[PDB]
Design an enzyme around this catalytic site. Structure first.
Site, short mmCIF file in Angstrom:
data_model
loop_
_atom_site.label_atom_id
_atom_site.label_comp_id
_atom_site.label_asym_id
_atom_site.label_seq_id
_atom_site.Cartn_x
_atom_site.Cartn_y
_atom_site.Cartn_z
N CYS A 1 -1.42 -3.71 7.85
CA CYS A 1 -1.15 -4.52 6.68
C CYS A 1 0.23 -5.14 6.53
O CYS A 1 0.34 -6.25 5.98
CB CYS A 1 -1.44 -3.71 5.44
SG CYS A 1 -3.16 -3.18 5.49
N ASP B 1 0.74 -1.25 0.00
CA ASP B 1 0.00 0.00 0.00
C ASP B 1 0.77 1.31 0.00
O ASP B 1 0.47 2.26 0.72
CB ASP B 1 -1.00 -0.01 1.19
CG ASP B 1 -2.05 -1.14 1.18
OD1 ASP B 1 -2.25 -1.78 0.17
OD2 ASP B 1 -2.67 -1.38 2.21
N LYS C 1 -6.53 -5.19 -3.08
CA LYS C 1 -6.89 -6.11 -2.01
C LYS C 1 -7.96 -5.51 -1.12
O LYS C 1 -8.16 -4.29 -1.11
CB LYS C 1 -5.64 -6.48 -1.18
CG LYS C 1 -5.00 -5.33 -0.39
CD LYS C 1 -3.84 -5.85 0.42
CE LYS C 1 -3.26 -4.75 1.28
NZ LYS C 1 -4.18 -4.34 2.32
N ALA D 1 3.26 0.19 4.28
CA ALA D 1 2.48 0.75 5.36
C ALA D 1 1.29 -0.15 5.72
O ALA D 1 0.75 -0.78 4.82
CB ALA D 1 1.91 2.11 4.96
N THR D 2 0.82 -0.35 6.94
CA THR D 2 1.51 0.17 8.11
C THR D 2 2.13 -1.02 8.86
O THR D 2 1.78 -2.18 8.59
CB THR D 2 0.50 0.91 9.02
OG1 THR D 2 -0.50 -0.03 9.39
CG2 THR D 2 -0.05 2.14 8.34
#
Lengths: 252, 253, 253, 253
Positions: free
Chosen positions: D171, D45, D138, D166-167
């Site tokens: 995740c 992400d 996702k 992150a983070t």
């Protein structure tokens, strides 16, 4: 020997010819090929399937088991991982929140397969050697709810030799799952059985067309005989090259 | 296929299905899973590569499949039932690449002919998705491996899955086997199932009905959907439907 | 000697927790997932290797944990609520073997010290499984990978998973976040969670409560289970509880 | 937060970590998984909602993270290593809809603020995907649930997964522990891991290195990839690396 079976076998062969021509022209029925680091899994060759008298008994055992023994003997000479499944339940009461039969009880007689009964034991003639794994499963394919994929992925297996019962039940769902998850399915024809007419023939034909290669036990034993010792095998990292057909272009 | 092969095949298969059904019933197989109370509809690969001619995956019979799929869609949409569509397509079709998404299915069927975002990947216009319906791009036969279908179905408490589409000897059967294993009641509307070679729809719908789901008429599915409360109000059936129980054989020693 | 490390760390972690909570609240995180209507209880690894002294995996604090675990069990079995137990054990601890079941977790923690069917593998006597309760032998941290837990929870329409056990920094956190991802509301009774090094219970419970489950008192869980209908009559909440929604940031283009 | 707390917090957490490591060491935990031979990189992400200011999911520290992610990418792209990117976005953000893809995570964090195909869903320009790299949309914390990531990694025999992003408290941790569970050796470049509240990066990387993956420096990871053969030529390590084995305790009776 049977009234219908000779005719059924003869006409299913004609239908199979016809279908193989269509499949072959379109580029289906390609060979997945043997990989380099195999595992063998025997689907439900437990007493409920191998011995007569259970709702799940399959005939043909007289021919399946010697062929299963030839594979076991070849594989354990190379230290190839061998797994066995027995499909059994710990809580067969469909009104309980801890029953493990789920919805398959709404389709087949799951209540007749108690865990740790005689019927749940792997057949004596092919008893598990030391270090071989017996997996108790709750659904048809050997993968859902078990740890088979944790062994196969963590230990880098690339080929799965599948044997057992039945062609129209647990063997086919296992083979379909395996090619989708990433394992090359080889099915030794003489080790597959069932209990009603035609299903072995047409399910093996369907498997060989889109999901795994149906081979002779002789081919599988010869392959295992030419293996290095398992500890020295490395997996094939991608698919075998295929005679590629070209994607049709957009008509507009 | 010559008509004598088609004709004789229907006949011997009927003999085999009669015989097999008697054995199954005697042993306790072929039970009815039954409709649940909170369904979803999934149309397996009724995308142009299967529904239109001229592709290597083209299935005949769409003339019969499409109007029946539409009857289901009309009944479902009226109730606010989730409708999912899948298309089996690939973003990277080079088998030598480390990010190819075809995996080992390329060693069995011609996956290289199914590009994502091409004509062939689009859902057939006759049954175009409505706003709010989900189109899932998938990479393997069953609709479940590698997709988020099971996340929708478990998080929104769906108990029944009406499965339509192509093919009987490929994606529809592996989706049904997975759904009953995972916990969703599979109902197959017989008329919405297609394929491309002789015998396969008959023997695969026979095998599905025997161990994996209930093969029904589109008429029965439409009548069920028409009798539902609005989806907002449906709650799932919490356990299996009661069955005629076979007794476990006692151990001989 | 004596170093006031436990009380010093609890006081500054609380300061970090106040700061993080202000940020999270402002951003709209740390929402309450809430209790659902049809619960299952899973006790993670309260087997002798964790509950008894003398094993590399032994956790202190069992004297506080076990009575609270017993309170939940007594309240659950009064309502016919499903109770599951895990024990993390291995049947082939030879990492050189192709049938070893330790995978790569052996390259991080001492998996070979946990034999299946040894004393160490046995669920502690003080909380012995009652008839019909399930004991799952698991091979990895979360109770889901490689087990059949998800099959029970999806097929029997469970919507809430009350999780207890060991450890906050290992098996309990991975189980909790796997649960919300798959679709089961995780409720963690604070007092039934243990670990073996400082700070981890505190900071892992904080992190779970922020993004993955609701950390409650055992009192609230026992009271929930005591106000429940009999399990046979429960039906799952079909969708998430409504939240105070935050608006999506507008795109620049 | 208050800077005095940031420094106090760092110092007291170091005491807690020191103490914890002493115990893990006397028990045989915190072993090294080690680098395998056939890696893939995944950037968790690093999309505009996290990298750019102004979103509820915005993370600070991108000025440090992104130059370090770029160094890994340049090294990987030179050997032909698979690089995957995830973005966490939703196609239907209406919690009352039966086709909403937010599930129960909406009852914990503001998932409604993350639209698919928005500016916010895009991978950050500074580390833009090269051709062949996969961007995975996702719906849950770990990059594995509901996506086809595992299909790529198993089918193409990847043994190591370098995770950035992150983070730490969300995740990244769930992805690493899923990865070791599934069979992929997780390597975490410490400098590329980010978050938005105090302490979490520190304690989550501690917990990860103790039981789930090896936290390394970016220099270490770059040196590894620079030493690699061309990706097409690598073969995975088939079993675990040998570990210093701890003595499995004998059963007291």
């Amino acid at each position: 020997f049977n009234d219908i079976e000779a005719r059924l076998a003869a006409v299913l062969e004609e239908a199979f010819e016809a279908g193989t021509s269509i499949y072959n022209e379109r580029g289906f029925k390609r060979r997945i090929g043997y990989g380099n680091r195999p595992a063998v899994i025997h689907i439900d060759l437990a007493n409920a399937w191998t011995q007569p008298g259970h709702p799940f008994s399959c005939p043909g055992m007289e021919t399946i088991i010697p062929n299963v023994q030839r594979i076991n003997e070849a594989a354990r000479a190379k230290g190839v991982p061998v797994f066995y499944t027995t499909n059994v339940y710990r809580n067969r009461d469909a009104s309980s929140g801890t029953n493990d039969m789920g919805l398959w009880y709404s389709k087949i007689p799951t209540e007749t397969l108690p865990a740790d009964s005689y019927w749940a034991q792997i057949d004596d003639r092919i008893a598990p050697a030391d270090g071989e794994v017996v997996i108790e499963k709750n659904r048809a394919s050997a993968f859902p709810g078990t740890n088979l994929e944790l062994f196969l992925t963590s230990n880098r297996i690339d080929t799965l030799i599948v044997t057992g019962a039945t062609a129209a039940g647990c063997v086919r769902h296992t083979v379909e799952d395996a090619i989708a998850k990433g394992f090359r399915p080889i099915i030794p024809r003489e080790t597959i059985g069932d209990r009603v007419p035609g299903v072995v023939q047409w399910n093996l034909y369907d498997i060989d067309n889109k999901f795994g290669d149906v081979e002779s036990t002789d081919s599988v034993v010869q392959y295992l005989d030419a293996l290095p010792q398992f500890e020295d095998t490395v997996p094939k990292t991608l698919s075998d090259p295929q005679p590629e057909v070209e994607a049709p272009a957009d008509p507009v």
